From a paper:
Aside from teaming up with various ubiquitin ligases, UBR4 activity is linked to two specific cofactors: calcium-binding protein calmodulin (CALM1) and KCMF1 (13, 16, 17, 20, 21). Our data show that the evolutionarily conserved UBR4 complex forms a megadalton E4 arena, in which inward-facing ZZ-DZB domains of KCMF1 act not as E3 ligases but as substrate receptors. The architecture of the E4 megacomplex is conserved across eukaryotes, but species-specific adaptations allow UBR4 to perform its precisely tuned quality-control function in diverse cellular environments.
Because the ZZ-DZB motif of KCMF1 has been implicated in binding Arg N-degrons, we measured the binding of the isolated ZZ-DZB domain to synthetic peptides by isothermal titration calorimetry (ITC). Screening additional peptides revealed tight binding to an NRT motif, and the co-crystal structure captured specific contacts with both the T2 side chain and the N-terminal amino group. ITC binding studies showed that the second residue is more important than the first, as an NLT peptide also interacted with the ZZ-DZB domains but NRL, NRR or NRA peptides did not. In agreement with these data, E4 assays showed stronger chain extension on a substrate with an NRT motif compared to other N-termini. The pronounced preference for threonine in position-2 points to the targeting of processed mitochondrial proteins, eventually leaking from mitochondria into the cytosol, as can be now explored in vivo.
Author numbering: 2 to 125
The structure:
Amino acid sequence: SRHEGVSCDACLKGNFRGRRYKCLICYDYDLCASCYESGATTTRHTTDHPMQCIGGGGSFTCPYCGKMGYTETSLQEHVTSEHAETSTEVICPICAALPGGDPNHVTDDFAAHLTLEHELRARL
Ligand SMILES: [Zn+2]
Ligand SMILES: [Zn+2]
Ligand SMILES: [Zn+2]
Ligand SMILES: [Zn+2]
């Protein structure tokens, strides 16, 4: 998924995909996974600083039938199988659970939303 509203203090890319790493010493300081894994530093930040990984995991509810307990992977498998042609408006549970996440991503094609905005790869 994307870290909406977040930009990397080292490479300046924003709303980046993959995992987000937040420094717990420097104020409002975040690294994309590429800059985190590669030891990127700026003026105030060192690789010694404690970092918190944000995003990933979680169990999700299907908005079309209400069944609970899916992972991001199994939710997408379920929706793309059992609800691929429906036009009811629903709100995305994954966006709402991710910090920065749109609290209300309203969509009438949830299967396309998962495929496009929640791709199933660790770096995405
Ligand atoms: Zn970066
Ligand atoms: Zn730092
Ligand atoms: Zn369902
Ligand atoms: Zn979403």
